[PDB]
Design an enzyme around this catalytic site. Structure first.
Site, short mmCIF file in Angstrom:
data_model
loop_
_atom_site.label_atom_id
_atom_site.label_comp_id
_atom_site.label_asym_id
_atom_site.label_seq_id
_atom_site.Cartn_x
_atom_site.Cartn_y
_atom_site.Cartn_z
N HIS A 137 0.82 -1.20 0.00
CA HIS A 137 0.00 0.00 0.00
C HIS A 137 0.86 1.25 0.00
N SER A 152 0.02 -0.26 -6.60
CA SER A 152 0.26 -1.22 -7.66
C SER A 152 1.20 -0.63 -8.69
N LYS A 211 -14.16 -4.90 -13.12
CA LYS A 211 -13.24 -5.61 -13.99
C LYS A 211 -12.94 -6.96 -13.37
N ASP A 212 -12.92 -7.04 -12.03
CA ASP A 212 -12.64 -8.28 -11.32
C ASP A 212 -13.78 -9.28 -11.48
N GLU A 217 1.48 -33.93 -7.22
CA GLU A 217 0.48 -33.12 -7.89
C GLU A 217 1.16 -32.23 -8.91
C1 HEM Z 1 -2.91 -16.05 -1.54
C2 HEM Z 1 -1.97 -15.73 -2.39
C3 HEM Z 1 -1.99 -14.32 -2.84
C4 HEM Z 1 -3.02 -13.40 -2.87
C5 HEM Z 1 -4.45 -13.55 -2.42
C6 HEM Z 1 -2.47 -12.22 -3.45
C7 HEM Z 1 -3.26 -11.08 -3.67
C8 HEM Z 1 -2.76 -9.96 -4.28
C9 HEM Z 1 -3.52 -8.82 -4.59
C10 HEM Z 1 -5.00 -8.72 -4.40
C11 HEM Z 1 -2.67 -7.91 -5.12
C12 HEM Z 1 -2.95 -6.57 -5.68
C13 HEM Z 1 -3.73 -6.75 -6.98
C14 HEM Z 1 -2.87 -7.40 -8.05
O1 HEM Z 1 -1.82 -6.87 -8.48
O2 HEM Z 1 -3.16 -8.52 -8.57
C15 HEM Z 1 -1.36 -8.45 -5.14
C16 HEM Z 1 -0.24 -7.74 -5.58
C17 HEM Z 1 0.99 -8.36 -5.48
N1 HEM Z 1 1.29 -9.64 -5.10
FE1 HEM Z 1 0.07 -10.99 -4.57
N2 HEM Z 1 -1.19 -12.40 -3.72
C18 HEM Z 1 -0.84 -13.62 -3.40
C19 HEM Z 1 0.35 -14.29 -3.53
C20 HEM Z 1 1.47 -13.62 -3.97
C21 HEM Z 1 2.69 -14.22 -4.25
C22 HEM Z 1 3.02 -15.66 -4.16
C23 HEM Z 1 3.52 -13.19 -4.66
C24 HEM Z 1 4.96 -13.28 -5.03
C25 HEM Z 1 5.74 -14.34 -5.11
C26 HEM Z 1 2.82 -11.96 -4.61
C27 HEM Z 1 3.45 -10.79 -4.92
C28 HEM Z 1 2.64 -9.72 -5.16
C29 HEM Z 1 3.23 -8.44 -5.58
C30 HEM Z 1 4.66 -8.09 -5.84
C31 HEM Z 1 2.21 -7.61 -5.78
C32 HEM Z 1 2.36 -6.20 -6.26
C33 HEM Z 1 2.21 -6.32 -7.77
C34 HEM Z 1 1.82 -5.04 -8.41
O3 HEM Z 1 0.69 -4.57 -8.33
O4 HEM Z 1 2.62 -4.48 -9.13
N3 HEM Z 1 1.58 -12.28 -4.21
N4 HEM Z 1 -1.46 -9.74 -4.61
C1 HEM Z 2 -5.05 -22.73 0.72
C2 HEM Z 2 -6.02 -23.42 1.25
C3 HEM Z 2 -6.08 -24.85 0.97
C4 HEM Z 2 -5.49 -25.64 0.01
C5 HEM Z 2 -4.55 -25.22 -1.08
C6 HEM Z 2 -5.95 -26.96 0.30
C7 HEM Z 2 -5.56 -28.05 -0.46
C8 HEM Z 2 -6.07 -29.30 -0.19
C9 HEM Z 2 -5.80 -30.40 -1.00
C10 HEM Z 2 -4.93 -30.30 -2.19
C11 HEM Z 2 -6.41 -31.48 -0.51
C12 HEM Z 2 -6.33 -32.83 -1.15
C13 HEM Z 2 -7.68 -32.90 -1.88
C14 HEM Z 2 -8.08 -34.27 -2.37
O1 HEM Z 2 -7.45 -34.75 -3.35
O2 HEM Z 2 -9.08 -34.87 -1.89
C15 HEM Z 2 -7.15 -31.04 0.63
C16 HEM Z 2 -7.87 -31.87 1.45
C17 HEM Z 2 -8.45 -31.35 2.58
N1 HEM Z 2 -8.51 -30.10 3.01
FE1 HEM Z 2 -7.69 -28.59 2.19
N2 HEM Z 2 -6.77 -26.96 1.36
C18 HEM Z 2 -6.90 -25.73 1.81
C19 HEM Z 2 -7.59 -25.24 2.88
C20 HEM Z 2 -8.25 -26.07 3.74
C21 HEM Z 2 -8.87 -25.60 4.91
C22 HEM Z 2 -8.92 -24.21 5.44
C23 HEM Z 2 -9.45 -26.64 5.52
C24 HEM Z 2 -10.15 -26.44 6.80
C25 HEM Z 2 -10.10 -27.52 7.51
C26 HEM Z 2 -9.16 -27.78 4.71
C27 HEM Z 2 -9.59 -29.04 4.97
C28 HEM Z 2 -9.24 -30.10 4.13
C29 HEM Z 2 -9.71 -31.45 4.44
C30 HEM Z 2 -10.56 -31.90 5.61
C31 HEM Z 2 -9.21 -32.21 3.47
C32 HEM Z 2 -9.39 -33.69 3.37
C33 HEM Z 2 -10.66 -34.07 2.67
C34 HEM Z 2 -10.34 -34.18 1.23
O3 HEM Z 2 -9.35 -34.76 0.71
O4 HEM Z 2 -11.17 -33.64 0.51
N3 HEM Z 2 -8.44 -27.37 3.63
N4 HEM Z 2 -6.87 -29.69 0.81
C1 LIG Z 3 -12.95 -5.67 3.00
C2 LIG Z 3 -11.69 -4.94 3.46
C3 LIG Z 3 -10.59 -5.77 4.09
C4 LIG Z 3 -9.25 -5.67 3.39
C5 LIG Z 3 -8.71 -6.97 2.80
C6 LIG Z 3 -9.63 -7.76 1.87
C7 LIG Z 3 -9.12 -7.99 0.43
C8 LIG Z 3 -8.96 -6.68 -0.34
O1 LIG Z 3 -8.24 -5.74 -0.04
O2 LIG Z 3 -9.73 -6.70 -1.45
C9 LIG Z 3 -9.27 -6.00 -2.64
C10 LIG Z 3 -10.45 -5.95 -3.58
C11 LIG Z 3 -8.06 -6.74 -3.25
N1 LIG Z 3 -7.84 -6.41 -4.65
C12 LIG Z 3 -6.85 -5.57 -4.98
O3 LIG Z 3 -6.05 -5.10 -4.17
C13 LIG Z 3 -6.73 -5.17 -6.41
C14 LIG Z 3 -5.98 -4.02 -6.63
C15 LIG Z 3 -5.76 -3.53 -7.89
C16 LIG Z 3 -6.31 -4.16 -8.98
C17 LIG Z 3 -7.06 -5.31 -8.79
N2 LIG Z 3 -7.59 -6.00 -9.90
C18 LIG Z 3 -7.63 -5.49 -11.12
O4 LIG Z 3 -8.65 -5.35 -11.75
C19 LIG Z 3 -7.28 -5.83 -7.51
O5 LIG Z 3 -7.98 -6.97 -7.37
C20 LIG Z 3 -8.15 -8.23 -3.03
O6 LIG Z 3 -8.84 -8.98 -3.67
O7 LIG Z 3 -7.31 -8.60 -2.05
C21 LIG Z 3 -7.75 -9.58 -1.07
C22 LIG Z 3 -6.70 -10.66 -1.10
C23 LIG Z 3 -7.88 -8.89 0.28
O8 LIG Z 3 -7.94 -9.94 1.29
C24 LIG Z 3 -6.95 -10.00 2.21
O9 LIG Z 3 -5.87 -9.47 2.05
C25 LIG Z 3 -7.37 -10.78 3.44
C26 LIG Z 3 -7.40 -12.30 3.23
C27 LIG Z 3 -8.79 -12.80 2.83
C28 LIG Z 3 -6.36 -12.75 2.22
#
Ligand code: HEM
Ligand code: HEM
Ligand SMILES: CCCCCC[C@H]1C(=O)O[C@H](C)[C@H](NC(=O)c2cccc(NC=O)c2O)C(=O)O[C@@H](C)[C@@H]1OC(=O)CC(C)C
Ligand SMILES: CCCCCCCCCCCCCCCCCC(=O)OC[C@H](COP(=O)([O-])OCC(O)COP(=O)([O-])OC[C@@H](COC(=O)CCCCCCCCCCCCCCCCC)OC(=O)CCCCCCCCCCCCCCCCC)OC(=O)CCCCCCCCCCCCCCCCC
Ligand SMILES: CCCCCCCCCCCCCCCCCC(=O)OC[C@H](COP(=O)([O-])OCC(O)COP(=O)([O-])OC[C@@H](COC(=O)CCCCCCCCCCCCCCCCC)OC(=O)CCCCCCCCCCCCCCCCC)OC(=O)CCCCCCCCCCCCCCCCC
Ligand SMILES: CCCCCCCCCCCCCCCCCC(=O)OC[C@H](COP(=O)([O-])OCC[N+](C)(C)C)OC(=O)CCCCCCCCCCCCCCCCC
Ligand SMILES: CCCCCCCCCCCCCCCCCC(=O)OC[C@H](COP(=O)([O-])OCC[N+](C)(C)C)OC(=O)CCCCCCCCCCCCCCCCC
Ligand SMILES: CCCCCCCCCCCCCCCCCCCC(=O)O[C@H](COC(=O)CCCCCCCCCCCCCC)COP(=O)(O)OCCN
Ligand code: HEC
Ligand code: HEM
Ligand code: HEM
Ligand code: FES
Lengths: 61, 54, 383, 244, 71, 85, 111, 124, 55, 110, 55
Positions: free
Chosen positions: C202, C206, C228-229, C272
């Site tokens: 922030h 971006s 757009k999202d 996987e």
């Molecule tokens: C749960 C996984 C993740 C979520 C939900 C997430 C979510 C977001 C969101 C909502 C933004 C701003 C909107 C956008 O640019 O798309 C963002 C920006 C960014 N994320 Fe992620 N992100 C995740 C994982 C990662 C990972 C794995 C990386 C890097 C290895 C990363 C690096 C960044 C960076 C550098 C930005 C700034 C990019 C920019 O706007 O120029 N994030 N992420």
């Molecule tokens: C980033 C979030 C998560 C990822 C990437 C993830 C990924 C996975 C994967 C890959 C499996 C194997 C699925 C299959 O082949 O059956 C699985 C199973 C499972 N996950 Fe998650 N998981 C997530 C979050 C959660 C959360 C929050 C819960 C809360 C308890 C949960 C509960 C389970 C359970 C109970 C199973 C076993 C049942 C099954 O295989 O369907 N997971 N998860």
């Molecule tokens: C409700 C307020 C709580 C604040 C956090 C909630 C979420 C929040 O900030 O939402 C935003 C809508 C955000 N998108 C962006 O930044 C964004 C910015 C620029 C361009 C685009 N796309 C283009 O067209 C974007 O999509 C988004 O999806 O980020 C989530 C991951 C956030 O969740 C969290 O970190 C909390 C937890 C659930 C991971």
């Protein structure tokens, strides 16, 4: 290029009937359709998804 | 057409009410329509089609 | 003053999702952030639901997953949604990282969001690995066996550490129960880090596809990026629907529908799909310890991009050589993926080694060389 | 690896259920259950299927209760705490031919016939693999193959030597619907049946997916109109610069 | 009688004739090789699995749709 | 490095007039057919090499490797496989 | 005789080897052995061959007394183990693993 | 990297006749393929500015040059979001692609690097 | 400017646990907030541990 | 008022969290606690009985109830932590009150 | 010493009607009995093994 009172050409995009109620209503029909399907989709999603919590088939037996 | 706008769209409370009532109707009719369509494209295949033998 | 700005709590939401000033020119690759948020929400909803039906005991785990498929109302959907969304989470995360590498989002002033991002990526790998084990099918068991035996390569203490993680002398009930607890927890940790990388971002806002400042021309996050999202949400849900309803097992391995059997080893243990590139990197090094270090280094090496990119220009939009190099890097990363699932046979052994060298040499040699040369070409070329 | 070591990959047969809008043929499912009951059930269990699962898929409630009531299952102990048996009910699971693995292997020259409840999902190929395997025993193993004792040659099985002998021969089953029980017909039916066993939600899942596809497509179309509508002020923006 | 038998025979004589002949020639060679003494004390014992797979794979490609059409 | 509305951190702007029209006054899909055809063709043509070159190279590599691998595990490839191990 | 004890689900082959069996095992030159080991490295007591009876190839259990080196024969891919439980013929890369076993008494071992 | 580095290295190349003979034509084609001119940018508009040094250099721009830069960035941002290219007078012609910022950033960096050197001086 | 104030992430910790300005006269009853934080941490640590053993 | 009001919700979540955790033991107090407490919901008119059966996942407290309380008892403490953090963020605007009830703006301590 | 005496009362009086299902023979070792005494107690009983080869 110089005068700021000469508004740039927007004729390619301007609707002739822009201030009619027909015109606004159409765009809200699109927004409202989208809201309608989102509401129908959310109801379906919630009802189907939460039904997992109702007694399963083995329990009902 | 102004009338339609004024009644269903102008007030957001009315617009949201219209959307939800439409959602209800869509949901009910779409269910019924898909059911019939699904039965026609899968004709003679489903349990309901063979149940009469038993 | 408007309530959304006055009230401290509302103001925090406001600053992130409504008045947040964004560049006006973000393209569709900026939408993976919100898709990853949607994946994370779907995984929490489906995950928590599966946890209401799953039993973590090894005598009952596999059966509880069958119960979910067969007896729970919509259980099939919840299970397949959860399993497939884990694949989609990695498609979106690779896309999001790819976007960040191509557009130089890792450069100053965004090193901190990037670095936290690399940790999010590691947590996602751990989370998805543990979840895979919970089924307690053959791939579950043999995956946990093989992966946790890599830890045995840590010198001196490795063996002891493995036994400590398993809670015993092999993968068994103790392992399964502890992976359940951790798999439940890790997604919450991952959500916190996801939120931290946003808070870190922030300060700079971006980046944008041109790599220039956007301070000159900002657009509120809502309504422009909100709407757009939605386009990509519905595009994602179309892809989700095709897998979940029509081909729920296309992305999976049938071996996980056989209950775990410590005696019988499956024909082939491959991870996987989304882990496959790192698996190929590990196979490339003949040494056990070397292989593990290389595999971890393949992820941690992303942390040096801020150093090794020597460009005075942010991102690749304007850098034809960097774009070609990036194309080769991405295709090589896919080839590594494919080499992760072939058998360890000629000629794939040598090929895997070449691709692994190419992967590392991008960060260590080519990107520093190419970015230095492009600096000189921009300056001479515009004189 | 040698193709032998992998197994021959099965052909893609046009199953009734292939196709986004296609259910199982339930008449085939019923025929397939009859093959399971008269042929496979001798050696293979179907432990994850309850009698209630057949109801309204392949059988009426009465037919399924009749099947359950012919069997004896373990009851709760009597008042002197002696064990007791009861007749089966719809909630009972279809019982296996063997009490444990050891009994199973002893009856099958060491090989353990797997449970068939998930076999269609637990093998690459699914129905096609089951169909190919059951129909794919050559009269004579290819010259030069050395079969281990108690093995049968089948090219679709990885390694070539399978502990399960050919079991389907013309007229081993007499179908109740007058369908000619040829080897191929019985394999098609039983493979359909086992596919249903592995994924019993299949019909419901694909109907809900049709609904999902339609609604999500419409919402995608509308979301694109709305996006373009709200963004048009930004896309259409024009500038006039007068250097100061 | 079994529809598959006729369809497989037809496909072997027709569109998969080259593969039929390959497998046949292979079998001839291997049987002849087994007939010869000190075959049991040989390093490499030739099989016909490869040719068999090529034949079967071909037959299946020409038969699959036809077979399911008559069930 | 980024401020907020009112102090975003732009160098001072002066001399730029910006004009736009209401979403209700515009055709959102004006010239969409032209853009979908001619604009997409232009933008794809300009980026084609950066996709085609790496994809075609790595596909060729894979094709050669998978065909060699297949050939090594045939009868014909017995000897070459023996040397390769 | 060879016993089969389950130990962590895996079978344990315990053979009470005769004098002439020990002799047969002590013959094979270490040189010509995929996995080069002598019986003395394997057993801590020549009369007690204790092994983890899982085949080193894929992980089937060898049928004992069968083979071609008259020890153990894995039926799955036809790998032959010795009276030391050393691999002689077939796909298997290693000799049948030895657990950590100690003779607490001369009549009882713990594994 | 520092702009100083880029500038010094470039000068080494332009000095060597051999080097310039092979590099200058490459650099001209590179810039043509780069395509920043098709968004109406000058090369210098692309340099990363979120650094203290660059912020200082931008503050030292003459007002006119600064106002023009803001227009080019806003114009380019608009072409980017429209997926259009510049046409006509908006395209940067090779003769208009002047290094307006390089002198300023070289002065800022000269001072910053002198400061680092002098922080490490040792009285002999 | 001090890093704890400059860096956005550190600044949030700083504003809550370090530079947060408090009244100078809070008595011992203002300490239950931190004890509730401690209870919540112990419950998470012990709870997650029990979940690794509970069926 | 806002930190206080969020606090009242934290208090409700804590009650729910601790109630569900109590059930997980599945001793006599666990069962009979879940039975009686979830039958209070039966008093909600018209839908009460239906809601109870939905929460139990069955017609009595049994395995489905236990599994779902486990999942929720794991989750609820995280929700409670988030609300705890929200009530602090809400408090940050005014800062802590003090035992005299006067402003502390005049005399602050880190 | 009382614990050991108490075990003897349990074994000779209570065990006729009451179970002690959560205690394993290993639990008595180094509390009431040596390892040898406890193994002797365990070895006097018969427990269900895994099925033989004919199942
Ligand atoms: C749960 C996984 C993740 C979520 C939900 C997430 C979510 C977001 C969101 C909502 C933004 C701003 C909107 C956008 O640019 O798309 C963002 C920006 C960014 N994320 Fe992620 N992100 C995740 C994982 C990662 C990972 C794995 C990386 C890097 C290895 C990363 C690096 C960044 C960076 C550098 C930005 C700034 C990019 C920019 O706007 O120029 N994030 N992420
Ligand atoms: C980033 C979030 C998560 C990822 C990437 C993830 C990924 C996975 C994967 C890959 C499996 C194997 C699925 C299959 O082949 O059956 C699985 C199973 C499972 N996950 Fe998650 N998981 C997530 C979050 C959660 C959360 C929050 C819960 C809360 C308890 C949960 C509960 C389970 C359970 C109970 C199973 C076993 C049942 C099954 O295989 O369907 N997971 N998860
Ligand atoms: C409700 C307020 C709580 C604040 C956090 C909630 C979420 C929040 O900030 O939402 C935003 C809508 C955000 N998108 C962006 O930044 C964004 C910015 C620029 C361009 C685009 N796309 C283009 O067209 C974007 O999509 C988004 O999806 O980020 C989530 C991951 C956030 O969740 C969290 O970190 C909390 C937890 C659930 C991971
Ligand atoms: C997964 C879950 C599903 C959700 C969907 C999300 C995917 C959306 C996305 O980010 O990609 C769409 C994305 C469209 O994004 P955009 O905002 O129109 O333009 C982004 C680029 O600037 C566009 O670059 P450009 O303006 O230079 O246009 C290039 C593009 C043309 O862009 C298109 O409009 C298509 O054409 C190609 O590069 C095609 C490759 C040539 C091979 C033949 O398509 C591409 O850019 C594809 C090229 C990637 C390689
Ligand atoms: C549970 C977890 C364990 C953790 C321990 C935390 C408890 C600490 C706490 O908040 O209470 C200590 C707290 C001492 O805190 P303080 O910061 O010195 O003064 C707080 C009072 O506002 C100052 O009150 P004050 O200055 O008016 O002093 C009143 C206090 C005298 O306070 C003394 O400490 C003496 O004496 C009484 O009210 C006793 C009532 C007569 C009974 C006979 O004890 C009380 O004053 C208890 C009074 C409650 C009735
Ligand atoms: C997730 C579930 C989403 C279901 C949406 C429910 C119906 C509301 C809706 O369509 O919003 C339209 C409405 C109205 O959209 P609007 O705000 O563009 O319309 C206002 C202008 N008039 C009243 C003249 C039409 O949006 C809302 O009220 C916001 C709620 C959406 C969340
Ligand atoms: C497959 C190989 C990809 C090569 C991409 C080269 C650029 C290109 O043509 O893309 C079109 C576009 C080009 O867009 P652009 O922004 O450079 O140009 C826009 C047009 N101008 C120049 C006028 C401003 O590139 C992208 O949009 C690239 C995003 C990268 C996503 C990669 C995900 C891979 C996962 C691996 C993770 C590790
Ligand atoms: C959590 C997992 C998220 C994935 C959702 C996608 C589809 C799942 C819906 C379940 C389903 O099969 O619904 C079908 C219709 O799909 C649809 O119509 C749903 C697709 C619509 C997209 C989602 C729109 C909002 C959903 C998310 C909001 C949830 C919370 C907010 C209140 C048919 O089922 P059916 O029609 O028989 O159902 C009974 C009502 N007649
Ligand atoms: C009298 C024995 C017997 C009969 C009858 C029998 N099977 Fe089997 N089957 C086996 C044995 C034994 C195996 C295990 C083979 C092995 O592992 O080598 C097996 C294996 C299988 C496998 C899995 C092979 C694999 O990939 O692991 C399937 C599917 C199968 N049988 C289906 C059937 C069907 C369908 C029928 C009859 C309609 C059937 N079987 C009849 C004994 C039998
Ligand atoms: C506010 C936080 C928490 C409170 C107030 C709380 C309260 C309780 C209570 C009252 C019990 C019954 C204890 C008993 O008599 O044995 C319990 C059991 C349990 N709790 Fe928690 N709990 C909390 C957090 C958690 C968390 C985060 C987990 C993570 C999984 C968890 C896992 C368990 C488990 C597994 C049990 C059952 C084992 C047992 O009874 O000891 N708890 N909890
Ligand atoms: C997990 C439970 C809770 C935690 C961890 C927590 C933590 C805290 C902390 C650390 C503070 C500031 C320091 C202090 O004054 O003690 C605080 C203040 C406060 N809390 Fe809580 N709290 C919790 C529950 C509650 C509840 C249930 C309420 C109200 C019903 C509440 C209302 C408040 C209020 C009003 C303040 C401001 C008081 C002031 O400083 O004058 N909190 N809380
Ligand atoms: S598994 Fe033992 S021989 Fe191949």
């Amino acid at each position: 290029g110089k005068s700021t009172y000469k508004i740039p050409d927007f004729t390619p995009y301007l609707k002739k009937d822009r201030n009619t109620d027909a015109n606004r209503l159409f765009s809200y029909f699109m927004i409202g359709s989208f809201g309608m399907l989102s509401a129908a989709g959310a109801k379906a999603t919630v009802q189907d998804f939460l039904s997992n919590m109702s007694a399963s088939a083995d329990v009902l037996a | 057409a102004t009338t339609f706008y004024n009644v269903f769209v102008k007030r957001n409370s009315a617009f949201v009410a219209t959307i939800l009532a439409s959602a209800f109707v869509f949901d009910m009719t779409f269910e019924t329509a898909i059911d019939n369509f699904w039965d026609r494209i899968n004709a003679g295949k489903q349990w309901k089609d063979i149940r009469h033998k038993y | 003053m408007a309530l959304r700005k006055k009230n401290s709590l509302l103001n925090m939401a406001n600053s992130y999702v409504l008045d947040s000033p964004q560049p006006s020119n973000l393209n569709y690759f900026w939408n993976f952030g919100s898709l990853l948020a949607l994946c994370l929400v779907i995984q929490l909803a489906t995950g928590i639901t599966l946890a209401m039906h799953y039993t973590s005991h090894a005598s009952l785990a596999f059966d509880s997953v069958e119960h979910i498929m067969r007896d729970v109302n919509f259980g099939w959907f919840i299970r397949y949604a959860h399993a497939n969304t884990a694949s989609f989470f990695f498609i979106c995360i690779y896309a999001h990282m790819g976007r960040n590498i191509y557009y130089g989002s890792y450069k100053t002033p965004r090193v901190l969001p990037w670095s936290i991002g690399v940790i999010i990526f590691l947590l996602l790998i751990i989370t998805a690995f543990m979840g895979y084990v919970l089924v307690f099918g053959q791939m579950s068991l043999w995956g946990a066996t093989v992966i946790c035996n890599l830890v045995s390569a840590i010198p001196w203490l490795g063996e002891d550490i493995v036994h400590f993680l398993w809670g015993g002398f092999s993968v068994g009930n103790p392992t399964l129960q502890r992976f359940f607890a951790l798999h439940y927890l890790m997604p919450f940790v991952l959500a916190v880090f996801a939120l931290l990388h946003l808070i870190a971002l922030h300060t700079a806002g971006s980046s944008n596809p041109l790599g220039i400042t956007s301070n000159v021309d900002k657009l509120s996050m809502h309504p422009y990026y909100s709407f757009k999202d939605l386009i990509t949400v519905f595009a994602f849900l179309l892809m989700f629907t095709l897998f979940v309803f029509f081909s729920p097992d296309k992305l999976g391995h049938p071996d996980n529908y056989i209950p775990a059997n410590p005696m019988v080893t499956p024909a082939s243990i491959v991870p996987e799909w989304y882990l496959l590139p790192f698996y190929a990197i590990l196979r490339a090094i003949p040494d056990k310890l070397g292989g593990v270090i290389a595999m971890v280094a393949a992820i941690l090496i992303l942390l040096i991009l801020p150093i090794v990119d020597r460009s005075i220009i942010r991102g690749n939009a304007f850098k034809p050589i960097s774009k070609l190099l990036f194309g080769f890097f991405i295709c090589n990363f896919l080839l590594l993926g494919v080499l992760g699932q072939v058998h360890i046979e000629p000629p794939f052994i040598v090929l895997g080694q070449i691709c692994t060298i190419f992967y590392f040499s991008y960060f260590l040699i080519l990107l520093p060389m190419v970015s230095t040369i492009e600096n000189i070409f921009f300056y001479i070329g515009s004189l | 690896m040698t193709a032998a070591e992998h197994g021959l990959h099965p052909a893609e047969y046009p199953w009734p259920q292939n196709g986004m809008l296609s259910t199982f043929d339930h008449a085939s499912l019923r025929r397939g259950y009859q093959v399971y009951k008269e042929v496979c059930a001798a050696c293979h269990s179907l432990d994850r299927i309850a009698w209630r699962n057949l109801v309204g898929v392949t059988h009426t409630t009465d037919e399924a209760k009749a099947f359950a009531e012919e069997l004896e299952y373990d009851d709760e102990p009597d008042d002197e705490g002696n064990p007791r048996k009861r007749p089966g009910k719809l909630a009972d699971y279809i019982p296996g031919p063997y009490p444990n693995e050891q009994a199973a292997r002893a009856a099958n020259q060491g090989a353990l016939p797997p449970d068939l409840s998930l076999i269609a999902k637990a093998r690459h190929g699914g129905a096609d693999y089951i169909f190919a395997l059951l129909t794919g025993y050559p009269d004579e193993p290819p010259a030069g193959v050395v079969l281990a004792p108690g093995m049968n040659y089948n090219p679709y099985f990885p390694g070539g030597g399978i502990g399960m002998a050919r079991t389907l021969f013309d007229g081993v089953v007499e179908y109740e619907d007058g369908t000619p029980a040829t080897t191929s017909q019985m394999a098609k039916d039983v493979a359909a049946f086992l596919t249903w066993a592995a994924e019993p939600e299949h019909d419901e899942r694909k109907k809900l997916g049709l609904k999902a596809i339609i609604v999500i497509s419409a919402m995608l179309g509308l979301s694109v109109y709305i996006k373009k509508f709200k963004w048009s002020p930004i896309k259409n923006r024009k500038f006039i610069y007068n250097p100061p | 009688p079994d529809p598959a038998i006729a369809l497989h025979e037809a496909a072997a004589e027709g569109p998969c004739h080259d593969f039929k002949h390959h497998f046949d020639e292979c079998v001839e060679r291997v049987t002849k090789a087994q007939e010869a003494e000190d075959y049991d004390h040989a390093e490499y014992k030739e099989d016909c699995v490869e040719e068999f797979f090529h034949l079967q794979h071909c037959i299946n490609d020409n038969t699959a749709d036809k077979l399911f059409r008559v069930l | 490095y980024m401020g907020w509305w009112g102090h975003m951190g732009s160098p001072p702007q002066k001399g730029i007039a910006g004009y736009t029209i209401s979403p209700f006054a515009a055709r959102p899909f004006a010239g969409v057919v032209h853009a979908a055809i001619f604009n997409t063709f232009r933008r794809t043509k300009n980026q084609a090499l950066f996709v085609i070159l790496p994809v075609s190279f790595f596909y060729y590599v894979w094709t050669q490797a998978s065909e060699k691998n297949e050939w090594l595990y045939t009868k014909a490839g017995r000897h070459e496989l023996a040397k390769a191990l | 005789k060879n016993v089969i004890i389950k130990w962590r689900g895996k079978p344990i082959f315990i053979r009470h080897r005769t004098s002439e069996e020990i002799e047969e095992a002590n013959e094979v030159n270490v040189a010509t052995l995929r996995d080069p080991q002598t019986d003395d490295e394997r057993v801590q007591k020549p009369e007690w061959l204790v092994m983890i009876g899982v085949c080193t190839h894929l992980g089937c259990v060898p049928i004992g007394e069968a083979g071609d080196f008259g020890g153990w024969f894995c039926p799955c891919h036809g790998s032959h183990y010795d009276i030391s439980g050393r691999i002689r013929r077939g796909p298997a890369p290693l000799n049948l693993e030895i657990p950590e076993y100690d003779f607490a008494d001369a009549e009882t071992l713990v594994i | 990297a520092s702009i100083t580095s880029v500038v010094k290295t470039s000068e080494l190349i332009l000095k060597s006749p051999l080097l310039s003979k092979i590099v200058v034509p490459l650099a001209k084609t590179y810039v043509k393929f780069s395509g920043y001119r098709q968004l109406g940018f000058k090369m210098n508009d692309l340099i990363i500015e979120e650094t203290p040094n660059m912020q200082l250099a931008l503050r030292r721009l003459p007002p006119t040059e600064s106002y023009d830069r803001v227009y080019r960035l806003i114009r380019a941002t608009q072409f980017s979001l429209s997926h259009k290219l510049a046409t006509g007078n908006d395209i940067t012609k090779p003769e208009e692609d002047d290094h307006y910022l390089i002198p300023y950033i070289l002065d800022v960096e000269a001072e910053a690097f002198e400061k680092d050197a002098l922080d490490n001086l040792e009285v002999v």
